[PDB]
Symmetry: C4
Subunit: 306 residues, 4 copies
């Protein structure tokens, strides 16, 4: 897999659509040196620092990182990366992991406020383990379905993993989904359906949008999640239960281990993600970090006025 | 009473307008078998499963259940069912009772969010007993009067009953109400009045609508409840107190025992419901479950475009 | 003072503008008999009962009560009543006091929701005593200044009084105010000023209205309170501090003792009210009840359509 | 420095733009005498009293105070005062300090509600010491950036200071900022950016406005704060991080000690303020008071109608 300045990039073992990007040891060391003056707390309080750490990392890769991240994420044939930095691979370096993921995400867009943490990222710990039963699979879905704005990317980092069996990230690229055409050509694929937010501590209003939509070239994209979609009647409800089964039993699903220090960064429009079951263990300890946001990048394109 | 595939249907002892629908033992056993993979918690989280369990039950009745439920509920001369399934009749099977009621309701419509439980249904326990005094009758009324959208059906299931004397459901079909014409022809019957929600934990705004309205054929329907209607002056207030007395002392009221495992499912537009007084007992235990929603079904009717 | 059916009416000792209305012993006894089936809790839950108790009391006075209350409250030369019922005069009869005041208020209008109690009336107890210092006078003001809708009447009942020295209700009829013309003819009298609600537990938005306004005949009326008016600058602020002093030192102020069982019922548009200082006492106990609302009554007047 | 009636005014040692205004001992004594009838609690409850105390102080200076405060604050070459009153200089006189600052502020405008205290001013105590680390500089910024309305002035008073080393107020007048022209002429200086409020306990909605704007003569003014500005992408984020560094390392920054009893009163449009680091000490005690508001004053200018 191609050799770039400051990192290497190779196809994963689960699929050619998922590329593995690894920052070299030298790059990692220099980046950590160069962002040491800003604790994670500074990035939380001053959002411009999230972009600044991104600039520092991209400059360390001779400005080849930003364009490669964008090309990969916007490429319909790919759209997903598994990213890591040599030397960042233990729970003790959680702050460095956050800085690294923040730098990468802010070269391609901006991470949105997360209601679970009150910050631009959220860290979650699973230990001492309906929705949190270890034997339960978290079904494949897209993020951001209960708000008006589109979530373009999902970032999921493994911060810690102790006594963990299973729990791989599940992924499904729409073009690997064998039932795509059947569901996409159904009239219900284009009908606006109600999507309702969870608890919501005084934060929302229901939104309406179809389960499928199209990209700029007319190819199918999805905005689906079983828990938040609210079928209005028996017609919508039975169809969605069939859609759900068609997605969950798809032969195109990928099962991707995400070792400590690594993170998945995927295009949320044509990739769905979920999580496999895992075995309970008294000393199990799993810590994750997530960021979700929109893409924001430059291109030669039209404008009006001056 | 007619024999259908998977159930029987006979007129109640309180009125020919109230039909009793009983699912046979075989049907019940097969339904429970076929929905065992989904705990009630799964139905709570994924609303399409509520419709799926309905499909499973209707398919078990050779698709004769859905049409019969609809015909009965939409029929002005009837509009009410008392439903049960042979073998489901003890508090220990509360989850099965919820699944059964959910299946039936979602063949004819969709159950709305319930603010008391935060779910699509609510379970309530009365034990160790102004509004909760056992000697007090809960006056006849319609549900959904403080919101803009119309509540078409009310579902009330008895989950448990121990040392309970009295407490029958009270019902009043508008066409059995001897004072209907007198109140309906009064000008105040058509005046929009203010209706205000209870406590409301940051959830509402007052709504305005008349106490009476009409169905598609021009027959009287009601949207009334003594607690939430808010007469603006002495004219409205005295008239409503007379209306209230005319309803509560009506000779057309039905008193219907609802044994454990059974549920009333009524058309909320032309049926009012309430609850009779019951005697306090140190070891009294009464558990109810409710669902309220709108009808949603197919018919050959007009549409525009393609 | 005139003899009516069921009550007597005589001018107060503080002013001919304030009339004292006393229900006879027979009237009181019959009213209490006739409203015994409804606890105060029933009136709280079913607002039509507030009007029904009013009807019962007015019918006991051969329908002469409603017209007299209205004529008095709407009469610019009067506009205030001090009301009591023979036999209702001890804290033990607080429920009867609430019923009586409720009956009177609902013959002339409707009492609004009170945020302090969550009900249509509020009861307050002062004991073990900046705003609650006993040596502090509560300045004269009008109620309802921080909402858009107009509050036409204020009702203040004394429920209990033990070891209480001072604390009389203060009243000021605008036509007894010697500085009325000076302030009313100032340009700031007609300038819309900002009024802001207290704490507000998620309930309001600021409102704007002038400190003075006019009745239907062009006579001055006021909508003023020192605590909630919010002068936007030094011009408004200095003028309002002068207005405040001109009102508080007015020679037209009345000081009215309100014995247990009695209540003031005043027109809030041209009467301002406040409360005099009182002496602290370890065993002091003062309990008040208030209701505030709008007038709603019939008159021969124009309408459109049919 | 000029001698006025009741006070003296001289240029500070940090800059000729910052004038020091000191009320004489006689003025101070007479003012305190004349406002003794109103506790601070009275000013909190009745906003017109804030203007009244201002009138009392200005009248004591033969009405020369109001015009001088305004001329100084509106003068682009100055715009900042350091104010004190002889005899008010110890934490025990905190109430007198509040009254004094209130009087001054309300001669030139009105202080806005402060969400931290729920009052028109807020008092804060720092003792037993990311944002509250003593070694951390609070970056230079303008107040009021996350609301639509403009904050014209910032008032910062030192109420108490014990065992305090460092912690000076930092100030930067835009015309002393050597990089002003570079940043002001950049296209991003005029682009509306998103500004988001902190926690907010059910109080806001995001606002959009550029980081720079212009005064009535076209001279640069700023509305900036690193914590609340929310760059939407890498372009905005990198530019703002450069702006931030250009401001924080400016050679035009002033470092102003604010002794107990003194207060800074600055024009928030062309002055930025911050706070220097201070050394932790077990017995450190620092108490501040702030007020923020808009200017409101008279001038000969046009109007329409009558
Ligand atoms: Fe997710
Ligand atoms: Fe009900
Ligand atoms: Fe009041
Ligand atoms: Fe500040």
């Amino acid at each position: 897999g191609q050799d770039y300045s400051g990192f290497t990039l190779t196809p994963s073992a689960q699929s050619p659509r998922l590329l593995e990007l690894t920052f070299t040891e030298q790059t990692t060391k220099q980046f950590l040196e160069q962002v040491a003056e800003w604790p994670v707390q500074a990035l939380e309080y001053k959002s411009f620092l999230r972009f600044r750490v991104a600039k520092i990392l991209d400059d360390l890769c001779a400005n080849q990182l930003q364009p490669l991240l964008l090309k990969t994420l916007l490429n319909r044939a790919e759209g997903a990366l598994l990213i890591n930095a040599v030397g960042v691979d233990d729970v003790k370096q959680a702050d460095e992991m956050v800085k690294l993921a923040t730098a990468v995400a802010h070269l391609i867009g901006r991470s949105n406020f997360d209601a679970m943490s009150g910050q631009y990222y959220a860290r979650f710990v699973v230990k001492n383990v309906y929705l949190r039963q270890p034997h339960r699979v978290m079904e494949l879905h897209n993020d951001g379905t209960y708000v008006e704005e589109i979530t373009d990317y999902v970032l999921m980092m493994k911060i810690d993993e102790q006594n963990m069996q299973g729990g791989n990230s599940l992924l499904l690229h729409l073009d690997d989904w064998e039932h795509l055409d059947n569901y996409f050509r159904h009239p219900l694929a284009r009908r606006p359906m109600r999507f309702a937010a969870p608890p919501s501590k005084n934060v929302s209003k229901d939104v309406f949008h179809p389960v499928f939509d199209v990209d700029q070239q007319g190819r199918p994209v999805m905005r689906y999640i079983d828990q938040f979609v609210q079928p209005k009647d028996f017609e919508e409800g039975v169809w969605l239960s069939e859609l759900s089964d068609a997605i969950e039993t798809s032969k195109g699903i990928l099962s991707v281990p995400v070792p400590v220090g690594k993170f998945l960064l995927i295009n949320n429009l044509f990739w769905l993600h979920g999580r496999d079951r895992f075995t309970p263990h008294p000393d199990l300890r799993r810590e994750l970090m997530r960021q979700r946001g929109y893409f924001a990048y430059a291109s030669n394109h039209y404008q009006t006025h001056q």
